[model samples]
Target: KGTDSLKSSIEKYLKDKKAKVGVAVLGIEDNFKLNVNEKHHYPMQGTYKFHLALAVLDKLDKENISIDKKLFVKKSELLPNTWSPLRDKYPDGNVDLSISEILKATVSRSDNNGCDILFRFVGGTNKVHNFISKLGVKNISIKATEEEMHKAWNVQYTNWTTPDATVQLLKKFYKNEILSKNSYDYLLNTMIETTTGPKRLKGLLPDGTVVAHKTGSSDTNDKGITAATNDIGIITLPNGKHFAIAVYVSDSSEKSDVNEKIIAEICKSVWDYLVK
Candidate 1:
């Protein structure tokens, strides 16, 4: 009842920006929300790390493995795009990094090498997919591996998710129902250090807002034309209230950053609505 005004404000804001956005805002305490297109699944990109982290943590607990346990990357594990400083800088492929550091790189930097290594170490993409099912995620699917991901090359097989499911995952984490309290805090801390999504949204909002989120970018070469880009995550308002939002902008027929800014503008719209 009290949310209609906020919803109206958001609708007007989006209309002004020439953007299409899907948002799901739920009160962590009250479990009420104002939603738009929450059922639609779009590419989540590296946000899959959040789900991977929870799954690995669950295995760590069951198998009595420490979070700091080291995993080595084989030469076969490296992928084409994304950051993998250790893998690229060290040709030996035997460099040792703790699970904690690798997971941090996976989320914070959206490192494909880190994600691939973790995927292989934690039992591959199928395991990650299985974990999503085990967690009862209805609107998400992670069925691609680094090898298969290589074939996509700006195609849409990397990952897919809905706005509602994403927020539900966050809501679950906040309640300590998603994973162990220690694991949940660890995940949040990594997201707090995330570098990708924040920069785009930075242009639209003021400083000091806590936004733990992830973004995906791909330039499809269609007869040498590039298009398709996206960003999605949780935004915590200045007043400590938060919402889960995802913005997908496709077929823009422009540079990827231009598409990214569209999502940023959507972020600004929501941010301004929350403050006013």
Candidate 2:
């Protein structure tokens, strides 16, 4: 009853997988829920870029700013020692870009400077945190900038989300609860084109399956613990049903591939279970 079969099936993948994993799945058409390690808080890593984009888009609507309005990024704003394909492309006007362009770069590519830029653009981490809290998902916390997260090894923990809150946000995002149609639609489409997380959500799905998701990952420590390897998304079935799924592989003793496989296997399990 109520997707328990899928829940039990999903448990096998995360159990004894040499990692601490959490999962939350919310159904679209059938209206079911599932969870594992639901009480845990996982560091968001780059996944919070999705949250930042949501916060920024909310400001876009409230502050009367057009998504296409051109914004400026000085070369000095581009911080070093973080992932940034956008910065690599514009290493040296200081790039002139739109809000939409910055969001796309942040969410799609997990661009770090793009992330920090939006942190400033939105007025800081507390604003985004407060915005999401007002939206009624308080269990999720947004506390640190990508810059701050890189300041030290444990600083990344400042931004964290519970497994269930992850899918709740995704479900709210899916139901168009907090974002306007144009806004949600834009972010939805942007997430579909995400160029990251190859071995996570979509890794084992049938070719051409549609999943709008974000991933977060961390470098393994010298002692071999991966703090965060996560993917959260709304996946669509062939019949047009959708489901929100969030996976967090945290403080993992496993290698990167092992951590990723937990997500892939569980995602495929959801896919098969839903399609059946």
Candidate 3:
């Protein structure tokens, strides 16, 4: 009774938006699931950092590599014209940072430079793509580096995921099927502490709600179309149960704030239904 009603609230909320949306949500210890435009593909901007992080950690685990291993960051590697908090903190680069430091900066802060660095650490975009593929998520494709995505208007589209594909990764991580004990523990805690996207996934949830999430955003083009505004996460419900959700709003002329509000309202709707 409650599940269908909760989803109707989401459908009604999205019915008027000008953008196309892809959404997937599941579980609160109730096996509840929801998907909208489930087969569509959407660009994943910073959101792929979460996936990249998993592959990097896997390399460490399988190679018996240490998490505290350090990599030297040259100043030239921090490219201009990209969003990166690590560059903001280390404007001149030329420093060595531990793997843990890099992962924290990459995931929790959406560091574009650190993303490419980890791409190098994990071999390449294809390796990371294959990394997740073997984990029971076959439909997600990762082909572009952050550097490439930033360089061209159309390259971001090269890295895309069906919304349901994203939730599968989230659900796998939640069930402890993806990473080593130490690695998954580190990743989940890092996601919960994500400092970006205040108005996306966690926006309308009550204060102190634990949301382990990553957000993706593409630029608004000269013609005013935003390619992607996305957020995906494992949300901890009030009763200590959990649900994994992914929302992708792609090719939208909607204002950025409104795109974010669409995600906020949808997650809020899910939360309300589960609690009741």
lDDT of 3 by residue, 1-276 (tens): 766777677788888898999889978356878888887888988899999998998889899999998899999988877877788888999998899999998999888898999998889999999989888897888999999887779999999999888887888888888779999999999999878889998999999999999999989999899999999999988889999999999999999999999999888888888888
Look at candidate 3 and tell me the lDDT of residue 241. Answer: 93
Off by over 4 Å in 1: 1-21, 30-32, 80-82, 153-155, 223-228
Full-model lDDT for every candidate: 0.67, 0.87, 0.89
The number of clashing residue pairs in each candidate reads 0, 0, 0
- Candidate 3 similarity to native, TM-score: 0.96
Candidate 1 vs candidate 3, TM-score winner: 3
Q: What's model 3's lDDT at 139?
A: 81
Tens-place lDDT digits, model 1, residues 145-199 = 4446657564354477766777777777666776767777787877777767654
Candidate 2 lDDT tens digits, 46-158: 88998998999888888788999988999898876789877888888387889888889899998999999999998999999998888888688888888888878999887
**Listing every candidate in turn, what is its Cα RMSD in Å to the true structure after a full C-alpha superposition?**
3.1, 1.4, 1.3
Error of 2 at 195 (Å): 1.9
Clashing pairs in 3: none
C-alpha lDDT of residue 132 in model 1: 71
